[PDB]
């Protein structure tokens, strides 16, 4: 009875493992020009937070930033546009709204461009039993949230009721939307990642590589993504391949990865570690290119503009640095 | 060389900085305390005696403001959100002290105390231990099967020897005897001096921290 079902699931696992088992990217990428040495220096230093910052998000126009306080920045000239009285940040594509959520198990939406020159809460979405790990604005009216309830949710701003629930063990720690805003990926603490379908409401694919995953980001193309685990290893997965391409690890580092992001054209993979500094790997190569040193504590967050003009990093010390 | 607009766009940033600086100094005059006891040991029964997710409670005592964070029903992995409580002044741990007869959640309390005390983030955070439930424990001394959970224990029927043995057993789990220090109170249901003990403990730890920062220690 139950043993028959166990054998059935086991042979499903065997058949899928046999079906996904070619070529190696690390060996086909041979005879290519290395980037060399990449040594971007700090261009702006941002002060004002008196805490360990935990999240940030670049603006849509690659000039505004958002970082018990929520600060809007100005990366060109260092000015505080507005301060609003947490583990997540989100900046709406239209620039009208921002989102924040943390251990309180609710996510709050703030409206920026209003009359009376004030920012006030527009929605307080609730329904999770856990802690929110990541939030992203799908549209101006739709937002997706991944929390520690082992489930993800697709919401609706105008009516706070949940629209879709994604389930299918451990806390989900990171979340990333595809460039076309039609697919969706999430990595959990059970050493697994999953690709879902927002329109359907059902899981599409799963990837297993080990320890908990706490960083994930889509490739600019939208057909691959990168994950960062706590075993001091970063990995790249392909949607159309259902496999793992390479491990971004070195023998001298035994420190986990806190944040991961790409650059435009998908050549430089910037990983913010917990060893007081970030690293700049060559996404197509197995060798490190550059190091972004200058932080005096654990690097938590990291972001790259849409035009790829600047890279903003924050750490457990209250200073947020904009490099170029 | 600034424009007419930008010169007026810098005064706004200066006012924002002033507001943040003035508001940032009101959060440095409050003491952070973390409730981390067992779920059914009496955490809900101790918050009311002093006065979804994390619940913050505010106390005032001798012109000192206390913030106490109760992580009641998070029901998640403790290793993924325990980073947020680094720098908390003290951790108030509560033990039922009458939960040894489940056979056992007494060993669960022992394991939880071992996990929290030897944490890497809490290597210098003092722990205040409250051995609760004196009423039932003292009333059950007539037929207490305390030797069941303690095979190596031999002692008199008086509550004093058993209480001393169990307290020494909880103190024995500490591995950092140079920085950390476990405080005990033996709280009762009908006490009134519970806040006094925590006030004295936080004063002691703050004085020791000041001495360590100054250079004498």
């Amino acid at each position: 009875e139950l043993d028959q079902l166990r054998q059935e699931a086991e042979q499903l696992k065997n058949q899928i493992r046999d079906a996904r088992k070619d070529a190696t990217l690390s060996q086909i990428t041979n005879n290519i020009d290395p980037v060399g040495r990449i040594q971007m220096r700090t261009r702006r230093t941002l002060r004002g937070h008196l805490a360990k910052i935990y999240a940030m998000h670049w603006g849509t126009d690659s000039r505004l930033l958002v970082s018990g306080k929520l600060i809007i920045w100005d990366s060109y000239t260092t000015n505080k546009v507005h301060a609003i009285p947490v583990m997540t940040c989100a900046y709406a594509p239209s620039g009208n709204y921002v989102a924040c959520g943390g251990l309180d198990n609710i996510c709050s939406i703030y409206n920026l461009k209003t009359r009376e020159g004030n920012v006030r809460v527009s929605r307080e979405l609730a329904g999770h039993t856990g802690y929110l790990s990541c939030c992203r604005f799908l549209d101006d009216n739709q937002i997706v949230t991944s929390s520690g309830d082992t489930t993800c949710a697709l919401w609706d701003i105008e009516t706070g009721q949940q629209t879709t629930t994604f389930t299918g063990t451990g806390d989900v720690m990171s979340l990333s939307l595809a460039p076309d805003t039609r697919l969706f990926v999430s990595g959990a603490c059970d050493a697994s990642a999953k690709l879902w379908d927002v329109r359907e409401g059902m899981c599409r694919q799963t990837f297993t590589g080990e320890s908990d995953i706490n960083a994930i980001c889509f490739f600019p193309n939208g057909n691959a993504f990168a994950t960062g685990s706590d075993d001091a290893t970063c990995r790249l997965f392909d949607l159309r391949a259902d496999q793992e391409l390479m491990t971004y690890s070195h023998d001298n580092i035994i420190c986990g990865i806190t944040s991961v992001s790409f650059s435009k054209s998908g050549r430089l993979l910037l990983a913010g570690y917990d060893d007081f500094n970030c690293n700049v790997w060559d996404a197509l190569k197995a060798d490190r290119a550059g190091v972004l040193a200058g932080h005096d504590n654990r690097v938590s967050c990291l972001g790259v503009t849409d035009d790829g003009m600047a890279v903003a990093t924050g750490s457990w010390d209250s200073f947020l640095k904009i490099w170029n | 060389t600034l424009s007419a607009e930008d010169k007026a766009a810098v005064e706004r940033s200066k006012m924002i900085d002033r507001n943040l600086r003035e508001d940032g100094e009101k959060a440095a005059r409050e003491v952070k305390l973390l409730l981390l006891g067992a779920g059914e040991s009496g955490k809900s029964t101790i918050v009311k005696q002093m006065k979804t997710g994390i619940v913050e409670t505010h106390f005032t005592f001798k012109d000192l403001h206390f913030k106490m964070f109760d992580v009641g029903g998070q029901r998640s992995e403790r290793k993924k959100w325990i980073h947020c409580f680094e720098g908390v002044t003290a951790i108030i741990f509560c033990v039922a002290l009458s939960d040894y007869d489940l056979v056992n959640r007494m060993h669960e309390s022992m394991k939880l105390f071992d996990s929290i005390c030897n944490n890497k983030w809490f290597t210098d955070t003092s722990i205040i231990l409250f051995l609760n439930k004196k009423d039932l424990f003292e009333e059950k001394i007539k037929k207490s099967p305390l030797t069941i959970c303690y095979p190596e224990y031999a002692g008199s029927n008086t509550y004093e020897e058993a209480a001393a043995y169990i307290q020494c057993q909880f103190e024995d789990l500490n591995k950092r005897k140079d920085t950390k220090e476990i405080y005990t109170h033996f709280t009762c249901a009908t006490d009134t001096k519970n806040v006094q003990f925590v006030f004295d403990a936080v004063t002691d730890v703050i004085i020791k921290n000041n001495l360590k920062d100054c250079g004498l220690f």
């Epitope: 505004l64 000239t77 000015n79 009376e116 020159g117 | 424009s3 930008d6 766009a9 005064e11 706004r12």
Partner: single-chain antibody, 229 residues
Framework: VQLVESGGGLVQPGGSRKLSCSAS????????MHWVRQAPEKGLEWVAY????????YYADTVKGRFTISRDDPKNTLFLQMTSLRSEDTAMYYC?????????????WGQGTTLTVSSSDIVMTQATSSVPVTPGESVSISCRSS???????????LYWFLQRPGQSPQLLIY?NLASGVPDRFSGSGSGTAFTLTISRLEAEDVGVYYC?????????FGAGTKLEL
């Protein structure tokens, strides 16, 4: 949302009086507040500008050291003390507000109050003045700036306030189009040449337009013909 201006000017020469204004539904503590005047046959020119926190009290170049501004954030009240009133004070005063992010200054205008007395400036001239609006057609306004209004910030200053026959003006372009119901309004800029364009006329489209000729501390862009007649 609402700005109520009070204080009626009818005094003998050599007197003084106050002009008050009260704001509702604002973060008045975080809005800069200007004061503007309009003569019966003239444009809209500054008389004072006040910044948030009372750190910038710029006054008028025509009259300096006689008028003063006082502000009350708890009372949400902004008012003007006038001294040594002369014969040439017979204008309509408005109490426009503005705020500068890193966004649409002069967005809201008050009702204004009358003042009558009993008995480095950019200037532009054109042959065509007070062009009547032809029904069933499209009207366009062309203007030229004496200097280059474009600044190294890249933000050329282009204001096109519209004043209908009535009580208070409106904003059309704040630098383009503001948060207004109409859409047909367009503004084209190229160096020193600027053009306001109307896609189609309407019953409420008729009015008087005012130019932009301001870069420095005195924003005297009021040079403009009155198209009322």
């Amino acid at each position: 949302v609402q700005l109520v201006e009070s204080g009626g000017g009818l005094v003998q020469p050599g007197g003084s009086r106050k002009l008050s204004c009260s704001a509702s539904g604002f973060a008045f503590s975080s809005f800069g507040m200007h004061w503007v005047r309009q003569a019966p046959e003239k444009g809209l020119e500054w008389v004072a500008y006040i910044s948030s926190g009372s750190g910038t009290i710029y006054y008028a170049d025509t009259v300096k050291g006689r008028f003063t501004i006082s502000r009350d954030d708890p009372k949400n009240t902004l008012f003007l003390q006038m001294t040594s009133l002369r014969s040439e004070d017979t204008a309509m005063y408005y109490c426009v507000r503005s705020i500068y992010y890193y966004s649409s200054p002069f967005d809201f205008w008050g009702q204004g109050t009358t003042l009558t007395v009993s008995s480095s400036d950019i200037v532009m001239t054109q042959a065509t003045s007070s062009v009547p609006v032809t029904p069933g057609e499209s009207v366009s306004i062309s203007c030229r700036s004496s200097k280059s209004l474009l600044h190294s910030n890249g933000n050329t200053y282009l204001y096109w306030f519209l004043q209908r026959p009535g009580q208070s003006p409106q904003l059309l372009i704040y630098r383009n189009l503001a948060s207004g119901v109409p859409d047909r309004f367009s503004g084209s800029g190229s160096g020193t040449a600027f053009t306001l364009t109307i896609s189609r006329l309407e019953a409420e489209d008729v009015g008087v337009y005012y130019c932009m000729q301001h870069l420095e501390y005195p924003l005297t862009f009021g040079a403009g013909t009155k198209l009322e007649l």
